[PDB]
Amino acid sequence: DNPPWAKPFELLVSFLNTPKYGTFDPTPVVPVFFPFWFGMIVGDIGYALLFYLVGRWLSGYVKRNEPLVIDLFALKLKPQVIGKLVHILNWMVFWTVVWGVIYGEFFGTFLEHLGVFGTPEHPGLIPILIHRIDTAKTANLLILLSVAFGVVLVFFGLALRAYLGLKHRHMAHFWEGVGYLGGLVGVLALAASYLGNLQAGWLQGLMYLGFGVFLLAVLMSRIWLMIPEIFTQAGHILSHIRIYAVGAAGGILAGLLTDVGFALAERLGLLGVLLGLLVAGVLHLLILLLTTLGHMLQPIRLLWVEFFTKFGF
């Protein structure tokens, strides 16, 4: 039982095993999180328009509700899976365009021939909030954003495990969740201190308190499982950098493809703009086909592993 906004993501949740009953439903988490960092990864408004065209074709199939059969993958989704996929794709492409606004470089570095968006050297054009290719501020900012998303998911999952242990009288899992939360808070404080900052005495107390909470949880659940698991949880926190790395990869692909296109058009022909755009579009389609599957897998991979293995399942 879910609201109609979360009904298509029930497919993604129920693709895996059913909940073990008396357990919270992680279904509404997916519409909150998955399209957000999917759009953060893509940021390519032209690719988003391509996705919207694909969604329009799939909605045409919904009108043509008789099944879509792809013998290449042996896939049969007559009304419901295709309707849910259309809903998911539209909800996802919305945040793709929204994060592409911050990712304002449109369909690659198209600013060379006629600059619509504007670098900070050109305030007359429309500004871009995050400079994409610049590395001084953008790299640190997006790495910290990914780390913050990982911390938010870690806190939510461990708090949910603790609450489930309280409700189900599963107190061992409650102590595990509390100790993991405290230990990871201490590890985050230690990492922030090691990044380089003064006033480390106040972070030292927080790290000591987190380590004490973790030590209490080890004294409760002492049987050989705790500290390798918390190391894997720290690695799971670090695993969220993917949403920046894949996005930077996509931006570099699009920018260098546009650079090759404008090298063909502007620098040699001065009239072969259409031919250069055709070559750039062909390369863009090839790159899109090769990379889209991984770019859409990595966020749902992050959810399915990181949040769900902690929460239950």
């Binding site: 993958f73 042996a74 590395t135 001084a136 790299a139 695993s239 950098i241 993917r242 920046y244 790395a245 894949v246 930077a248 990869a249 570099i252 599957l293 991984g294 897998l297 990595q298 991979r301």
Partner: protein
């Protein structure tokens, strides 16, 4: 505005990307071989085989991340 340090940074990021791609290819070799065998056997294992094939891409992804950080230091 650097000198030979910029070239050494380029060497380091090239090594990082190349060896990360090498590790990803090493994983994808056996995983894709098993996946193609499963596809030829059942033809319904496409989702699992494709997911298992696309999972090791995180290695080259993070190598590219480190190279981009090095280009930031460049």
């Amino acid at each position: 505005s650097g000198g030979l340090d910029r070239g050494l940074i380029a060497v380091g990021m090239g090594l990082a990307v190349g060896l990360a791609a090498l590790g990803t290819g090493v994983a994808q070799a056996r995983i894709g071989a098993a996946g193609v065998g499963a596809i030829a056997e059942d033809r319904s294992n496409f989702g699992t085989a494709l997911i298992f094939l696309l999972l090791p891409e995180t290695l080259v992804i993070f190598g590219l991340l480190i190279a981009f950080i090095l280009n930031g230091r460049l």
